Subunit: 340 residues, 4 copies
Amino acid sequence: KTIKIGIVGLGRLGKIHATNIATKIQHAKLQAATSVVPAELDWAKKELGVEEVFEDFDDMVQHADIDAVFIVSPSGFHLQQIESALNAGKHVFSEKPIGLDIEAIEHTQQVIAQHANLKFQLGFMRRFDDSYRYAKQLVDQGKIGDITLIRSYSIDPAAGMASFVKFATSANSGGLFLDMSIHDIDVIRWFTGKEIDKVWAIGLNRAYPVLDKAGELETGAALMQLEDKTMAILVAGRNAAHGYHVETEIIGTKGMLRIAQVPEKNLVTVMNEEGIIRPTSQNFPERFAQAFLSEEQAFVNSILNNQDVGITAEDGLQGTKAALALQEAFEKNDIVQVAS
Amino acid sequence: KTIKIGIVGLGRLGKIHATNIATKIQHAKLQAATSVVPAELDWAKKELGVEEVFEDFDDMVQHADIDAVFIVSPSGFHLQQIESALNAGKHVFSEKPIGLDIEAIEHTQQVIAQHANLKFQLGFMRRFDDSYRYAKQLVDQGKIGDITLIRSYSIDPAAGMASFVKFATSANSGGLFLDMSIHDIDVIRWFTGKEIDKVWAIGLNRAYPVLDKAGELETGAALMQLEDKTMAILVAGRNAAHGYHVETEIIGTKGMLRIAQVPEKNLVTVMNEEGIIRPTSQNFPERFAQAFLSEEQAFVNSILNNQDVGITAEDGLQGTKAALALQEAFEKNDIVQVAS
Amino acid sequence: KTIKIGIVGLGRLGKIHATNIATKIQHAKLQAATSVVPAELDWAKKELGVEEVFEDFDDMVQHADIDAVFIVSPSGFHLQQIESALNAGKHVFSEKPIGLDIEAIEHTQQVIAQHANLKFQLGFMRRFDDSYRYAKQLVDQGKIGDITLIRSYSIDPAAGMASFVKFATSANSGGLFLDMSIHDIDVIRWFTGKEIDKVWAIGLNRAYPVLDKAGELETGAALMQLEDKTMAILVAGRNAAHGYHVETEIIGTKGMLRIAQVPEKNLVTVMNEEGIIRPTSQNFPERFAQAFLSEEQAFVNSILNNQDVGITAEDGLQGTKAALALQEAFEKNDIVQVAS
Amino acid sequence: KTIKIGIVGLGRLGKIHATNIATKIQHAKLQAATSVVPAELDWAKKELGVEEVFEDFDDMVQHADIDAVFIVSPSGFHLQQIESALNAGKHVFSEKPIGLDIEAIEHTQQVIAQHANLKFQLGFMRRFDDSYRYAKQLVDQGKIGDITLIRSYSIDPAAGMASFVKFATSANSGGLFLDMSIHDIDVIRWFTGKEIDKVWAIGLNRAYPVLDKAGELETGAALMQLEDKTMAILVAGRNAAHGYHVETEIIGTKGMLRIAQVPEKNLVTVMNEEGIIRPTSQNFPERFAQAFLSEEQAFVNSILNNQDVGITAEDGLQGTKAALALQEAFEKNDIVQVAS
Ligand SMILES: NC(=O)C1=CN([C@@H]2O[C@H](COP(=O)(O)OP(=O)(O)OC[C@H]3O[C@@H](n4cnc5c(N)ncnc54)[C@H](O)[C@@H]3O)[C@@H](O)[C@H]2O)C=CC1
Ligand SMILES: NC(=O)C1=CN([C@@H]2O[C@H](COP(=O)(O)OP(=O)(O)OC[C@H]3O[C@@H](n4cnc5c(N)ncnc54)[C@H](O)[C@@H]3O)[C@@H](O)[C@H]2O)C=CC1
Ligand SMILES: NC(=O)C1=CN([C@@H]2O[C@H](COP(=O)(O)OP(=O)(O)OC[C@H]3O[C@@H](n4cnc5c(N)ncnc54)[C@H](O)[C@@H]3O)[C@@H](O)[C@H]2O)C=CC1
Ligand SMILES: NC(=O)C1=CN([C@@H]2O[C@H](COP(=O)(O)OP(=O)(O)OC[C@H]3O[C@@H](n4cnc5c(N)ncnc54)[C@H](O)[C@@H]3O)[C@@H](O)[C@H]2O)C=CC1
Ligand SMILES: O[C@H]1[C@H](O)[C@@H](O)[C@H](O)[C@@H](O)[C@@H]1O
Ligand SMILES: O[C@H]1[C@H](O)[C@@H](O)[C@H](O)[C@@H](O)[C@@H]1O
Ligand SMILES: O[C@H]1[C@H](O)[C@@H](O)[C@H](O)[C@@H](O)[C@@H]1O
């Protein structure tokens, strides 16, 4: 039949997932919707046709006619919400990060384990991106030999700095590497099958020095050594002049590849007095639209066919963990072991 | 609130539209199907859950519980099936070209006129393509000035040679200019708002002699002059070694642009002993997947909203007319006025 | 040893060649020079080290210690100046076109053949271009199979429009197709080994109203059929907004190539709010600096080795002839046979 | 007048410098050559017309008829050869790196200062590269704002692996960082005007067993922090499957640029069954041919015109200083300070 879904969270990404499930995802019905903001639930109802609205997640979980939940609430809320819906026997989708505190994660990683009758999936959608999957297949086919180095760039567009400042001046966290680099960590683990041993990170505020006063970072770089001495390089950022730069390079013994060497918007190339111009993708909903739909449909399908997707809490744990180590290494300006 | 659709044709493109309608197109349901190949209908029943199968189009429109038809039969059958379905009070989507005979088209267009309450939409899917649309927007905003020249390439992949030969020998395709270049003719018309005045076409078979034996042209080239002296160049063919080469260049007074200068498959760049490699899109279902989906949903949405899409019988007529002039100019090896 | 060379003509291109021979050309020596200028030669005199100034090739070729001339005088003067030096017993380099009147050209062709001890070289410099040569080697190696179509663009930069008008309004030379398209004709003959049978050309002025006033063509396009039904497409123009667009595409039975698909200036890529930008080459001395140098040196080496370069009067003849055929097809707006 | 030049070293690069000097460089003559390989000196006599040959450097500088020397001997021999040539009254060009020991360089630095009337130029040829100069121009013109990060890759071709092993096993190279990464260090300094504060470097051998045997690193990666907190990333290696990968990326407050994002060979694009192919430059002689010529002529002109080029022992010392730090960091696998 049709998988009834109650979503929690209708911010930036909530609205995308909401809209997709409602209108694009087959075998799916967006039945419930939770938010502490009434306007969103009114948008939910008088735009997507949502039936049961709530202001408390558990309220949604106990009374709603749903089989599964999409957790698109802020990070600090994920772990209790995952435990809570599993306890109510819901299948669970949670956005990244899985959570912030390791202990809690380790704890939730068993609740999920003890509910092996329920599907759990984490929102590392890059795993579903056609381009990443294309490369992943090349690597698995042995087309570049053995991986020696991965470089991954995740830089937010400068058009977003305005609202990042202001926000940064009103609130804090989760930090540059926990916001931007955790997808890269997962991409690194996915491709190599290895784990990260130690990291060093540096950072710089140069476009907007005021970020020094707000305890935030505009640009960051890191070097990592994996457990098998495979090398990794990261850049994270918030000030990309050209758009949304997410690029992943993989160097091997027999070749080399790059996924979005440049963030090509489409098949159009423009020529004018500037020279040869290629328009670019501008933000994550644009760049990763396809990936979001594919992860959404994967979840549903994993429930109907009783099949594991393969993105586990362990992947969530190690993501958050390595992210934290980058942050710590930045603060200390020194090398940090991930296991500590 | 839900459109039951009957499709005729389940071949190279028929199987795509069907699959799309049954599984991805909202407020639509693939209710019926028609094909002269029994294995295909078996496939519709089993894999797509299609209710009603027929081997006669006239039979489907009379007896199926449908609200609309998708015409994906070979080109020589289009006009008969449009009129029939119209006369049966069903909404009509027809693939290109609209027909192969001008006289018959004119007649069909007047039948469409009597039924000014039924929707008619032609399958010039390029108008729905994200990249083409983007370029259109650019041109509309004045980014390249006024158009001076359009060059358009539409070249089928060498790897599809066998499947083409089967298509080409199972029914009249109308030839290279009517089967391929008609997309380009429509693009030129879409972009300039002008009509083609006179043309000269040349051709050549050099790679695949089997095409001659099927009376099909392997590679064609043409020069066209529009009514306002806007210039245009076309190339069509059946032998692109690298994949599906569909490219449109628009030259203007203040710049120029190219749509799929090269048929980039994705965001993956590969580097090895051959050099820098970009994988390519391989065929129309891959390249134009999005477009096909968009035109399908636009067709369906037009029925529910009672508003026209703008791809008209007149666009079909004028396309076919120019295509026939290219064919004629090819046969005569001389300039031909579209007026004749 | 050292080849002693005298040059006639020292304007836009003349100053390039002379400056090259003096300073970068090996086993060669600039000695003589001639022009309608005391000036420009006033320039030549001082910071080139030009000893001898004249106003008559004949006057100039009379007293000088040289083995050879290098003809960079205007079109009309080539031939008469060609025979004179051969009448003087010198080896000869001349620029394109070889001349402008067919019967005249056919005459000189008889002469050159009668001085089978002397070197005659024509300045189709694209033959010495590293990129053109690379493509030629690929084609000759069978990498693309047999050539079915060649498309060639030669569009001058819009930034050069005022200097063009200045140049043109005061001294005609010699039409668009004859000025721009002749290199492309020569490239087509070079790669194919074939000759052009019939052509049709059209044209448009839309961007720069001064060209109307000057009686010049802004953009032209042409289709050509070669003697073996090999296809060819040409565009020439004066309004390339992005730079100097000289591109040549070669489609074959097993592949296709593009020489300067876009005119990349260097290895630098720029990324900003416009998107991804490739700076471009701006004019012919930039783009073909290497070619010009290589043709100068080949000529010299040709003397020293007594070995013929292979760019003949016949290549000159067929170039002007095809260019004249294009010009006539533009004027008449009909197909023209090259043999007329 | 003519600068009589004597060269030491006729290996991988020495044969190129020699050939250029004798055949391409104005106002210069390759009078003398020194090498520990007799077959090499013959080749100079037979092929380049070198009058005086030697097996010992001191020998050449005492007894040859020269004004200046090019030092292209292995790196551990540079400093003693610079000093010896200076004492003998000769101008000096030395290849990179200037030396391998800091105290020695400081001493050689003081010797250069005592002969301030003689020219000293170090062979950081990238400073002369047209594409690097263009990027430097853009940066100086504010086109990308202030520099936040430089990533630089220098990865030798896998095809050159045999020639490398000969080079590395015949004399001490100094390791990957002193031999390769030093170019990038200089670029970072040239662009930023700042010095490197601290580094961490890691490394891996995975493809070619000979390298470990020869005590060489196959691929290295490094994070550096400069004195003003400007970030830097390095990768160097000996196993690039696609060609010679020398790439330099500059990230800024207002934009970003890439020098040789990929090492495009020329203007030719190839299209076939593998997709879209760009051929690549294969090795240093190819990629930096122009640079090498420019620095040679710059050296020679500096002697004739008595104007300093501006690439100094201090540039040498600061580069060797940072490279050693990288080496130590690699060996210890921990952060190192350049000062201490
Ligand atoms: N997959 C990806 O690439 C990305 C994932 N994320 C993850 O997004 C989650 C959503 O982020 P945003 O939409 O940007 O945040 P947000 O602030 O934009 O929206 C949060 C949603 O929070 C709901 N919410 C807040 N407190 C709640 C509560 N106590 N109970 C129920 N709902 C509550 C808000 O009302 C709203 O419904 C985070 O895990 C974020 O990191 C965000 C961006 C990208
Ligand atoms: N928009 C586009 O890019 C494309 C459009 N097309 C158009 O789609 C149409 C279908 O082409 P393909 O699918 O390649 O052809 P095909 O040869 O693969 O399939 C034809 C289908 O029509 C059926 N058919 C044949 N004669 C029939 C009749 N008298 N009554 C009912 N059904 C009949 C066959 O059973 C088969 O199912 C053509 O007009 C073609 O021009 C095709 C490919 C791409
Ligand atoms: N190979 C190529 O791609 C190119 C070839 N050319 C050709 O090179 C030649 C020079 O063209 P431009 O430099 O553009 O011309 P220009 O406009 O610079 O004039 C060139 C020179 O011709 C001289 N001249 C004019 N009338 C003369 C006369 N009666 N006797 C002696 N000298 C006279 C002028 O003094 C001037 O010094 C032409 O044949 C031109 O078509 C030009 C551009 C590119
Ligand atoms: N700027 C650049 O991009 C490049 C710089 N280099 C630098 O140039 C230098 C030469 O490297 P390669 O030519 O690759 O080395 P190589 O090993 O290919 O050539 C060495 C040459 O030096 C001679 N030689 C060795 N020991 C000698 C001694 N004690 N006295 C006199 N001659 C001696 C050998 O006979 C041979 O002719 C190195 O310092 C290297 O770092 C090398 C290649 C590229
Ligand atoms: O029918 C033709 C269609 O118009 C094209 O888009 C497609 O590429 C061809 O294969 C079809 O024959
Ligand atoms: O003489 C023309 C030359 O052939 C072209 O290449 C160039 O672009 C034009 O400026 C010249 O007029
Ligand atoms: O000495 C190294 C030089 O600096 C590089 O440019 C070259 O690529 C290497 O092969 C050399 O060893």
